[PDB]
Amino acid sequence: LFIEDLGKVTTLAIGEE
Amino acid sequence: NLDTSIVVVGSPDDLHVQSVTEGLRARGHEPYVFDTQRFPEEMTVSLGEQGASIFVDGQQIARPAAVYLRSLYQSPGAYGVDADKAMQDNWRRTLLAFRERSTLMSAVLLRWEEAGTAVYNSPRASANITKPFQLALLRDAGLPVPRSLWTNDPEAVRRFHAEVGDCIYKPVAGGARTRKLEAKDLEADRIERLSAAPVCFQELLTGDDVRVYVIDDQVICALRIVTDEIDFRQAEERIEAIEISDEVKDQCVRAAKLVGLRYTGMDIKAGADGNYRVLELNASAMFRGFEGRANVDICGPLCDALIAQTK
Amino acid sequence: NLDTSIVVVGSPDDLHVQSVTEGLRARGHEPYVFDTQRFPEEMTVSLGEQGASIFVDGQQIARPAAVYLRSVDADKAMQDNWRRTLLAFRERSTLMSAVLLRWEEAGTAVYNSPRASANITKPFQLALLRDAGLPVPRSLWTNDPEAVRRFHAEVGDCIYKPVAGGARTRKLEAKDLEADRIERLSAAPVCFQELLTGDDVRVYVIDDQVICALRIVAEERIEAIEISDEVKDQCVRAAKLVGLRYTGMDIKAGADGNYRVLELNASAMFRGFEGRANVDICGPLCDALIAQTKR
Ligand SMILES: Nc1ncnc2c1ncn2[C@@H]1O[C@H](COP(=O)(O)OP(=O)(O)NP(=O)(O)O)[C@@H](O)[C@H]1O
């Protein structure tokens, strides 16, 4: 992944969707 | 035997589900909490061939007046879903189970909307919410957005960089923080990692983020978020209610309509020229942290909009 | 350099992509083929903020005239980091779906637009059809054993399909209603329907016009038939309700000789029906795709 920290975690960066 | 006039879709452990149910009680209404996460094991759903034939835990719910849609928990990767052990065990049947649940709950929600239920953020809007399409819908409708490039081609990135200047990169759909596009990132070694998945490059806007809340074509407030850069040992976030020109208000309302949202927390950001570009409209925005740090009431207007549907 | 007027989304290894491309070639339009299976690792797509800034492999492809939308090894990736892999697939899917939504908004006639997925959710699809006055079988989606005991008691002998689709239709027999047998659905929802004793019929619709209808009666002996203009009307109405441009419907007749709509398919196959009943399906489809280019 180019955005390596995509899966690093309760994922909160997707809490508004 | 239950006042399913207002329905909150979400787990009762969701701080915003809690906030909305409490708001609704203070207004005199007892919401029905529809927790899809308990579907196969601890809930009963029966759908007839007629749109009105809907039975949850034995009771008929043909048409709520309004629904507050926090989350349907469709994939095991969502916010409120602790599905780690099940996915580590057998991820194929777990994805199957989540798809099985989702088709039924989406059927319920779509039946409700078809019956006239005012769904505060209907799932259909998902189509319009895909970012690379949302930003273009807005742009071609007259709203300013950042100079963007969603891509997997390093050459496109290099030419976009040479056209724009300072750039940031962030996920296409979401799931990680946006970062400044540094020189290290344009070296072949790691810019060739775009073959694994595309990413979104944008012009680095230097102004301040502003979170505008819109409910039923009316701006509730506009909160400026500032990163307190003064003391580096303890950076704090100062959030302040600010006044936005009526031009900005009408633009935000137009955007909410375009995408197809009733309740939306949209992020905008000003450039060097001090003018706002629309960053993104959220389909189930949060509001608690903003209420607290900015001393504003967002849950109140939401509960009132919901209750106004029952009348 | 290329036409990019008629676009076929799918893999060249697909028989249906092959047929459609052959019919468009034999008709004068060599179509652009968007083989999205190549997307991340091989081919390249770039979107700008302007809806027309769509670049596939360096060539700008804003606004095709028409699109035929047809369509991984990761078990290691799903057991090593499933959250990350699911997010990666969502990044890709998001960009591709964005391409299609942009074209549709630009004016492109996408034959089966992904926006139809909403209306296609089966448990909601049949309610859409019935609540708009169309004949549908008496149906019951449930995980409640008492609900299915009552449904059986009211409608009589009935059948059950998998909720989302994939398996064969089976008959609910008295032995299944026992506590042991019926309790299984406490966590295994299926769809129960009144058992229609007529003959299954597949009907194809394209741009508000029925193409053909085949009774699929031992080996498959599907044979072409002709149906009333009332049922033709009902079928095109159903397809306009669900929001499909090219659909392969399943309808079944009751004991009373009247047909009930069973199910519309987002992108039905035809290579196996057009050979077994000797009618032309791909032909009229290519005719519609080309007709859109005029306007
Ligand atoms: N063009 C830009 N220039 C500078 N900062 C940006 C830009 N676009 C987004 N950001 C930053 O990203 C934040 C907005 O989040 P956004 O990127 O829209 O969603 P996300 O972080 O991808 N995930 P989510 O918040 O769940 O949608 C803002 O606070 C900005 O700091």
Q: How far apart are CA C9 and CA C17, in angstroms?
A: 8
Residue with tokens 């329905």: B7
Asked if C90 has any chain A CB less than 8 Å from its own CB, the reply is no
Q: Which helix (H) or strand (E) holds C76?
A: helix C75-80
Residue with tokens 């036409």: C3
Q: Could you give the 3-state DSSP secondary structure of residue B153?
A: coil
Q: Are A13 and B78 in contact (CB under 8 A)?
A: no
Instruction: Give me the residues paired with residue C109 across strands.
Output: C66
Q: How far apart are CA B53 and CA C139, in angstroms?
A: 10
Q: Are C138 and B49 in contact (CB under 8 A)?
A: yes
Q: Are C214 and C279 in contact (CB under 8 A)?
A: yes
Closest by alpha carbon to C129, among B100, B114, B119?
Answer: B114
> Order of strands across the sheet with C6-9?
C32-34, C6-9, C66-69, C109-111
Structure token digits, residue B98: 């989540």
Ligand 1 proximity of A4 Cβ (cutoff 6 Å): no
Q: How far apart are CA C27 and CA C156, in angstroms?
A: 51
Q: Are C99 and C110 in contact (CB under 8 A)?
A: no
Greatest Cα pair distance, chain A, in angstroms, is: 23
Q: Are B124 and B113 in contact (CB under 8 A)?
A: yes
Structure token digits, residue C189: 């929802």
Mutate: best of C94, C103, C131, C161, partner B, most B CBs <10 A: C94
Of A3, A10, A15, the CB nearest to B176: A3
| Reduced 3-state DSSP string for B74-104 | CCCCCCCCCCHHHHHHCHHHHHHHHHHHHHH
Structure token digits, residue C23: 């019919």
CA separation (Å) from B152 to B39, B156, B173, B302, C95?
A: 39, 8, 14, 40, 10
Distance from CA of C138 to the nearest CA of B (A): 6
Helices (H) and strands (E) in chain C, counts: 9, 16
Structure token digits, residue C154: 């009211």
Of C55, C102, C163, the CB nearest to B100: C163
Q: Which residues of B touch C59 (CB under 8 A)?
A: none
- Beta C66-69 vs C6-9: how paired, if at all? parallel
Phi, psi dihedral angles at B270 (to 5 degrees): -90, 150
Q: How far apart are CA C275 and CA C273, in angstroms?
A: 5
Ligand 1 proximity of A9 Cβ (cutoff 6 Å): no
Instruction: Give me the residues paired with residue B200 across strands.
Output: B150, B170
Q: Which chains touch A (3 or more CB pairs under 8 A)?
A: B, C
CA separation (Å) from B16 to B9, B71, B81, B256, B306?
A: 11, 10, 15, 21, 15
Helices (H), chain B: 15-26, 39-42, 84-89, 91-115, 126-129, 131-140, 154-164, 183-186, 188-191, 246-259, 288-294, 299-308
Q: Which residues of B touch A7 (CB under 8 A)?
A: 175
DSSP B259: H
Residue nearest to atom 12 of ligand 1 (CA): B178
Q: Do C83 and A11 touch (CB under 8 A)?
A: yes
Structure token digits, residue B149: 């490039």
How many Cα atoms occupy the beta-carbon half-sphere of B300 within 13 Å?
6
Q: Are B156 and C51 in contact (CB under 8 A)?
A: no
Asked if C84 has any chain A CB less than 8 Å from its own CB, the reply is yes
Distance from CA of C62 to the nearest CA of A (A): 27
Can you tell me which atom of ligand 1 is nearest the CA of A15? 26
Tell me the residues of chain C between 254 and 273 that have a Cβ less than 8 Å away from chain A.
Answer: none
Helix %, strand %, coil % of chain C (to 5): 35, 25, 40
CA separation (Å) from B243 to B168, B239, B240, B286, C243?
A: 28, 13, 10, 21, 43
Residues contacting B164, CB < 8 A, separation 6+: B147, B203
Helices (H) and strands (E) in chain A, counts: 0, 0
Q: How far apart are CA C248 and CA C213, in angstroms?
A: 10
Q: Which helix (H) or strand (E) holds C140?
A: strand C139-142
Residue type, C16: H
DSSP B61: -
Of A5, A7, A16, the CB nearest to B282: A16
Residue nearest to atom 21 of ligand 1 (CA): B177
Quoted resolution (Å): 3.6
Q: How far apart are CA C87 and CA A7, in angstroms?
A: 7
Q: How far apart are CA A12 and CA B176, in angstroms?
A: 9
CA-based radius of gyration for chain C: 22
Residue type, B257: K
Q: How far apart are CA C151 and CA C145, in angstroms?
A: 10
Contacts within 8 Å (CB) and 24+ apart, C113-120: C113/C69, C113/C243, C113/C245, C114/B127, C114/C69, C115/B127, C115/C243, C116/C242, C116/C243, C116/C244, C116/C266, C117/C266, C118/B106, C118/B110, C118/B123, C118/B124, C118/B127, C119/B110, C119/C241, C119/C242, C119/C243, C120/C242, C120/C264, C120/C266
Q: Are B6 and B310 in contact (CB under 8 A)?
A: yes
Of A6, A10, A15, the CB nearest to B176: A6
CA B247: distance to chain centroid? 24
Q: How far apart are CA C87 and CA C74, in angstroms?
A: 13
**Domain chopping of chain B, boundaries:** 1-121+287-311, 122-145+206-286, 146-205
- Beta B6-9 vs B32-34: how paired, if at all? parallel
Q: Do B51 and C140 touch (CB under 8 A)?
A: no
Residue of B nearest to A12 (CA): B79
Residue with tokens 């979400």: B10
Structure token digits, residue A1: 């992944």
Q: How far is the CA of C82 from the centre of ligand 1 (A)?
A: 24
CA separation (Å) from C21 to C7, C92, C182, C267, C269?
A: 10, 25, 49, 16, 15
